[PDB]
């Protein structure tokens, strides 16, 4: 079956998926569907579909918790996160990572921070501004993730880890904190959470040596979960399976 026909066949479902996504995510996913429609090979199409699955899913996940879909090329790195949020510590950070220069660039899907206080603004910037994903409370977002791992499956499809450093009730409202999140829709679930864990237990360690509060989440969903049990609300999972997972399902049938 010809991909232009298959993409004509699910175009309606797709258009529903783009409408439930953050605006940047929707633009980015439109391209991926035009690229899939127009692919020369099942190998080229499949590679884009794999991206649209992941790209769509972060968009839904970001949408479900108040976060903003940060496209891949502009996702902040560790060094950008360190330098922007903690300039004073930036010089010390550069040192700890001298033997591990690979840690300098690690990029969480989501890099969150608690809004701190102690239109016709500037709108164009010649260089990218390293983006600030601001959340009202890391802790309250942390709570809702621990609860869902113990009922009030989820305990198996994630990890929550916090670096042990202490922050006061003024210190949480005085100082910057970091919640780093990895989300997936991969087949092998305990891979996301264990692969990242190897790097991430060590990184949380290093951020605590440098005096930064940093919080972590890894989680994943797979097709075989009950619809009422995804990390994103059940109505959303109705759309992702009907759009993107359907597009895989036909793309394994013709190849």
């Amino acid at each position: 079956e010809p991909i232009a026909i298959i993409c004509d066949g699910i175009e309606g479902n797709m258009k529903q998926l783009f409408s439930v996504l953050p605006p940047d995510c929707a633009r980015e996913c439109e391209v991926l569907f035009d690229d899939i429609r127009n692919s020369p090979t099942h190998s080229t199409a499949w590679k884009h579909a794999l991206r649209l699955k992941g790209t769509a899913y972060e968009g839904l996940f970001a949408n479900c918790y108040g976060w903003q879909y940060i496209p891949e090329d502009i996702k902040p790195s560790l060094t950008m996160l360190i330098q922007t949020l903690f300039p004073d510590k930036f010089e010390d950070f550069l040192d700890r990572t001298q033997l591990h220069p690979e840690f300098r660039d690690l990029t969480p899907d989501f890099s969150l921070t608690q809004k701190v206080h102690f239109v016709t603004e500037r709108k164009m910037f010649p260089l990218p501004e390293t983006p600030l994903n601001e959340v009202h409370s890391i802790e309250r977002i942390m709570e809702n993730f621990t609860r869902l791992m113990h009922g009030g499956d989820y305990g198996e499809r994630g990890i929550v880890e916090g670096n042990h450093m202490r922050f006061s009730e003024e210190d949480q409202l005085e100082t910057r904190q970091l919640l780093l999140v990895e989300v997936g829709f991969q087949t092998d679930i305990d891979g996301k959470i264990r692969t990242d864990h190897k790097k991430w237990k060590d990184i949380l360690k290093l951020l605590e040596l440098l005096g930064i509060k940093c919080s972590f989440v890894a989680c994943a969903d797979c097709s075989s979960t009950p619809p009422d049990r995804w990390w994103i609300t059940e109505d959303r999972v109705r759309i992702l399976k009907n759009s993107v997972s359907f597009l895989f399902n036909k793309l394994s049938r013709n190849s």
Partner: antibody
Amino acid sequence: EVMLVESGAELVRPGALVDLSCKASGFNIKDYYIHWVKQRPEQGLEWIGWIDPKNVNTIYDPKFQGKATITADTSSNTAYLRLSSLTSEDTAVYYCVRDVNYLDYWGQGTTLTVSS
Amino acid sequence: DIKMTQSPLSLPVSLGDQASISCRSSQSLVHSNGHTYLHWYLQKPGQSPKLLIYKVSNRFSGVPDRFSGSGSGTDFTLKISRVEAEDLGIYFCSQSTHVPFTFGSGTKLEIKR
């Protein structure tokens, strides 16, 4: 080294027109925005506007719209400030500035005195 | 038109002393993107303004560490830990959050001798 060199008509009569230029060396100005800032002894530092050479968009302070017009030539790596309808209120030092998302490097500045 | 207000207008300090320069703005300088576009410039006599601290608290390349930028919201403080003789000049603060950019009236740093 980053350097911004402004040169322009050092004196022009009232009512006339003046073009100031800004030669950038040490960077391509396609990769930044370029600003003009006016400086007077009492009036103080006063922003004017910026130009984006990449795709040629300009944003001015409304008090200056119609007075100022920033244009740019990326091939010769220069931006221009045209001030028209000159008065004494236009007698000032003028700087062009590099925009990296914040203004960081400034030129030596060219002086303009408007009289006959 | 964010108003930028600098106090004191004049700051006589003795070499090796600490100087405090305050910049206050008409509105919050916090961008919706979460950044703050308030910056400190020093124009030595008869030179052009040179950038010290960008976005509240970042030293510009080649800028000594005795220069430190603090503040949030609308209240900002620039501090010089050890006043030196070369540090003469007028210190300007500037917001680049809102169009039009606006600059303070200036703090004249003098040296006691």
